[PDB]
Design a protein around this ligand. Structure first.
Ligand code: 402
Ligand code: 402
Ligand code: SF4
Ligand code: SF4
Ligand code: SF4
Ligand code: SF4
Ligand code: SF4
Ligand code: SF4
Ligand SMILES: [Cl-]
Ligand SMILES: [Cl-]
Ligand SMILES: [Cl-]
Ligand SMILES: [Cl-]
Ligand SMILES: [Cl-]
Ligand SMILES: [Cl-]
Ligand SMILES: [Cl-]
Ligand SMILES: [Cl-]
Ligand SMILES: [Cl-]
Ligand SMILES: [Cl-]
Ligand SMILES: [Zn+2]
Ligand SMILES: [Zn+2]
Lengths: 621, 618
């Protein structure tokens, strides 16, 4: 396979394969008398105009060139016996630590499969090198690591009887960057997703759209003065990023890491995708909003190198099991006169409300459900159950989430969703990022064959799929809970009261002896209105749903920019999800056989101790 | 093997009780029909029964259900092992299960029970999980994992009651507490313990008056609380409390358990000031150096290697004198980017003292680590490597005179992959009680030598323990190297003395340096205020939180007779150790020089910064 480019392209004598940070990666015929720089120019320079940093020769083994070799004739002697003649070019926009992690993991794979048994003796040593790099990338290291790396490098150079080990020169030439990463916990290229915080960059022109758009008044700054984010109050709703006319606000971009992981041999890569992605991505390829192209996305992902493709709506069904259980418990306790219970119960997978409450509604910390999000539920099940059944350690599986927003990036970055430095969601990719991957890689969703999603964690019901538009989470929870409480199967499962588009909606649901009052908000200002009304006693609710983005996750800032009327397109996506729900035979989360298998085999019933241990978390510790 | 609070090391129809029983030991047990403990003298304090392990390698686990009911004699499993570990409500279950797992793993690894080989990694993983809980880096999911691991083992061991399952079932509350609330209600998990005022507080206000930084809020008799964000861990509040209301943990039991773990390498370092005060508990006068007595006692306890912190102090002097020479050369060269004075002190208490009140002086202190952390990092990254041991196969224990060193060793900057360079700290009083209850009398035991590679030290290093010693040693080395002249008289009496704030005026060749010394954080505040106002200029300063320096630490034995006289006796004792040494400059120590020649290659090198330097005020 092999390949790399910022706009992303996995490209599957006197001929070389250039795949670095150059524009137009490809196979090139080198003129006789040519420098490195001239080869770069024949490929069109480096993405943007970031200057040359280094060039790796041979992916398993070769040389490592820096500026000192840029204007010198490219001696082919560096292509020693059976090197395959490959060059990875680096610009100043690439982090050395991530690249060296990729190099070490590649070498380790080729050792482990027996292609390079002569290097077996150093396996353990090299593994430690990776671990050291990993500790640096996660920000859990001291400067001592450098010392260790050096000795390890020296160790390798002793056992391989080699005159030049790569890591020694790497340390010598980029000590400044390494020290920056370690002491300042900063990656100046923003490739280390665990060291990146949502920040306004130096490019900012002091316009102001972000200062107006923030619903919590989190941004300070006036006139052309650079604006700053009070990160201790940021909800990661992404309004500022979407409203910025420029690249002034950065929250990272995990595309290159995805490509490198896909290009690592014998590395298991699995993906989940949010309900709302499948009704919007196709817009970039000639489909209308609302058209479900999940099979096209599955085919494209598998073409890219994904070994297993799963679905977040399975996790949404599991979330519904847990949340309907908790809601019924709370209602039963309330009807019994239990004042220890707290109402309403908040059901929402949106992270944005967490801080939104912590910073303005400390009297309602007992309201939201303890259940994790569908994304993290999927991740924990994939790594702690699915992988275990297949005999894989959690670090032997790379779980990638395809989601419509940056708040999911922040969620996947939370340490609560990790163990032994392994994050349940390894990293998050936005809809736009995947669109650009497909576009630059030649994947056209309009013309690719359909492929099925994998079964164990891909099958989902309509209740789960409606999660992606406002009112879906509470609608699914209500379906299951009311059917559970009344014993009655509803002829019409759609609750039109919970649907609609008003920022703040009130509904009244009647079923047998059971009567519930529901409040729904999309847009954090409407949410503030609703919560102020609840606190003042102006309105009483049994349950509420809060979404930060208008229309729900189908309206996330990571989705493709709408064409035509924005509101019309968002409504089209929502009705597309509703039509997916209507096309499914099963339309209650509790009918999904695979979630029930999860309960029958491991957790034994919803809200059990095991279910709490795995699928629940502590918001507001 | 042995274990009990207040310490003990106890090195057919026969039983060996060694848990939380008062008066541990073997016991001819009668065959008559809860009061079993009473025949052994009850439990330490009056703490209620929690559980009892039968057989140390493997056996049964008894809980309260057998307490007031017929305790069947024969139920002692055929592999009873004739040993019993009884647990009280004062013991953390997580630490006990860690000790059990490590004992089992060691006895597997030495071949004593090959039949358990199949479960090794499994059991090992359990330990790791427990460790993550004890270090506070876990979610509730760990419980899930543990359960399944247990289920696996019980299948292969075909056991009717697996120990981990019963642990989860009966002590779920404690595990959930540890994980979600990051709280060990027995305070055995040293990494979850913070300096706190307990419920025994009555509201004296002694703590509020004694604190030099006004870190305690509260009025009347209302319970007082510590604002941890400003605490210097000087320990004045602990000493001043009329009760035991303020607790900062006690790693005695962990030390005993590690010593009782087979094939576990335990090494120790000791602060300079310990050796002139500990002997007071055994009839020695203040100032008498009993370092050999301490070494012999530690070896009797089971310690495999005994080292000295003064070696690390010599290394620290090397680095700090290098930095001072660099800074003075730059200042004399007209470099205004440089910062003076330079602060030389291994006391952590000034860190928070400056960051919260002197943010204009963050570039003053040297980037050099403390001697304790330098010793720890060298022991684990070089010494252990030389002897072919991973850092987790070595347990480094620091014997220090204060609580601030516990908090320092607990800092994440001095750790890697959850392994802390200083695994835990033992105070002088704690070691005194260990010796007292184990029958070790330092005035009545043979002398033993300290281990060499990291134990030999100079007088410059040893004077660290009393006020003015750190700066005196740094000045000795730096001036001797800067002038090329070896001083006939190496003692700088101006830096000695007992005043809270001392000023010195040092001349050597063309060099004239102005020095400021403070012991007591209020006197230090006076000095730093004077520096800020420009009333006085200093080239270097030394700050000690405790009066007299570390010899006056809150972890030292309470003085007998006149306090000031005793502290002066200890300080002059350290000075007399210095006077008895052939080498009295840190740069003469062959082992530190070997460290430089073989690994770091010169002071202030890149490797020296990587290992022996840290970033205060990140
Ligand atoms: N986690 C989760 Fe959600 C689920 O299911 C997604 O995945 Fe959303 C979508 N689509 C996103 O992003 S988050 C907020 N709740 C509504 S939907
Ligand atoms: N670290 C260190 Fe120090 C050294 O050397 C000790 O060990 Fe002190 C002593 N004695 C203690 O406690 S800390 C403060 N500096 C003066 S001395
Ligand atoms: S929008 Fe982009 S540019 Fe305009 S202010 Fe906010 S950040 Fe600066
Ligand atoms: S993200 Fe939402 S909240 Fe955080 S700053 Fe940008 S707008 Fe304000
Ligand atoms: S609503 Fe907008 S922000 Fe909240 S989760 Fe769905 S997408 Fe992310
Ligand atoms: S006991 Fe110690 S803490 Fe409690 S009040 Fe008196 S002084 Fe303050
Ligand atoms: S420790 Fe020192 S500083 Fe912290 S509270 Fe007690 S006295 Fe005040
Ligand atoms: S002076 Fe020595 S003992 Fe007293 S606190 Fe500072 S360091 Fe600990
Ligand atoms: Cl290598
Ligand atoms: Cl972010
Ligand atoms: Cl692959
Ligand atoms: Cl499965
Ligand atoms: Cl299918
Ligand atoms: Cl959009
Ligand atoms: Cl031992
Ligand atoms: Cl000796
Ligand atoms: Cl004292
Ligand atoms: Cl060297
Ligand atoms: Zn980086
Ligand atoms: Zn504990």
């Amino acid at each position: 396979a092999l390949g790399s480019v910022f706009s992303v392209f996995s490209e599957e004598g006197r001929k070389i394969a250039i795949c670095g940070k150059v524009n137009n990666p490809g196979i090139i015929e080198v003129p006789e008398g040519a420098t490195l720089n001239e080869i770069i120019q024949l490929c069109g320079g480096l993405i943007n105009k970031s200057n040359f940093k280094a060039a790796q020769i041979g992916l398993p083994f070769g040389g490592f060139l820096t500026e000192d070799s840029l204007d010198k004739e490219f001696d082919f002697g560096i292509f020693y016996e059976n090197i395959a003649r490959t060059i990875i070019v680096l610009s100043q926009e690439d982090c050395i630590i991530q690249f060296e992690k990729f190099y070490i993991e590649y070498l380790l794979a080729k050792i482990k499969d027996g292609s390079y048994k002569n290097y077996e003796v150093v396996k353990e040593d090299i593994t430690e090198m990776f671990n050291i790099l990993n500790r640096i990338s996660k920000g859990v290291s001291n400067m001592r690591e450098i010392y260790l790396l050096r000795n390890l490098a020296v160790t390798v150079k002793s056992k391989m009887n080699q005159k030049h080990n790569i890591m020694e020169e790497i340390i010598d030439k980029f000590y400044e960057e390494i020290e920056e990463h370690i002491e300042e916990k900063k990656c100046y290229t923003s490739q280390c997703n665990h060291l990146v915080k949502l920040t306004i960059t130096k490019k900012c022109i002091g316009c102001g759209a972000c200062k107006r758009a923030c619903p919590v008044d989190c941004i300070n700054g006036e006139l052309k003065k650079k604006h700053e984010i009070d990160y201790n109050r940021c909800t990661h709703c992404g309004a500022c990023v979407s409203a910025c006319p420029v690249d002034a606000i950065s929250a990272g971009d995990n595309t290159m890491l995805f490509l490198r992981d896909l290009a690592t041999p014998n590395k298991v890569v699995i993906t989940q995708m949010a309900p709302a992605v499948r009704v919007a991505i196709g817009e970039a390829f000639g489909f209308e909003p609302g058209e479900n192209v999940e099979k096209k996305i599955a085919a494209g992902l598998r073409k890219l190198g994904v070994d297993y493709v799963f679905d977040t709506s399975w996790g949404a069904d599991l979330t519904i099991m847990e949340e309907a259980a908790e809601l019924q418990e709370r209602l039963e306790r309330h009807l019994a006169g239990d004042e220890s219970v707290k109402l309403p119960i908040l059901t929402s997978c949106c992270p944005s409300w967490i801080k939104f409450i912590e910073q303005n509604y400390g009297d309602m910390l007992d309201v939201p459900s303890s259940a994790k999000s569908p994304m993290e539920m999927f991740a924990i099940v994939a790594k702690e159950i699915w992988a275990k059944e297949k005999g894989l350690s959690r670090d032997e599986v790379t779980s990638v989430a395809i989601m419509p927003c940056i708040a999911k990036k922040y969620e996947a970055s939370r340490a609560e969703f990790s163990v032994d430095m392994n994050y349940d969601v390894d990293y998050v990719i936005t809809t736009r990022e995947l669109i650009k991957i497909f576009e630059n890689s030649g994947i056209n969703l309009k013309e690719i064959e359909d492929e099925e999603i994998d079964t164990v964690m891909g099958e989902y019901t309509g209740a789960g799929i409606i999660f992606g538009r406002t009112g879906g989470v509470i609608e699914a929870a209500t379906r299951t809970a009311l059917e559970k409480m009344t014993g009655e199967r509803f002829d019409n499962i759609e609750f039109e009261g919970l649907r609609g588009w008003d920022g703040f909606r009130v509904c009244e649901l009647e079923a047998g002896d059971i009567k519930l009052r529901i409040g729904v908000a999309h847009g954090l200002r409407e949410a503030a209105k609703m919560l102020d009304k609840i606190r003042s006693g102006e309105e009483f609710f049994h349950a509420i749903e809060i979404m930060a983005c208008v229309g729900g996750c189908i309206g996330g800032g990571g989705q493709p920019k709408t064409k035509g009327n924005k509101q019309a397109a968002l409504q089209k996506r929502a009705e597309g999800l509703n039509n997916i729900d209507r096309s499914k035979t099963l339309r209650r989360s509790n009918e999904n056989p695979e979630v029930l298998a999860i309960y029958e085999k491991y957790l034994d019933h919803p809200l059990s101790n095991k279910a709490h241990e795995l699928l629940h978390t502590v918001y507001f510790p």
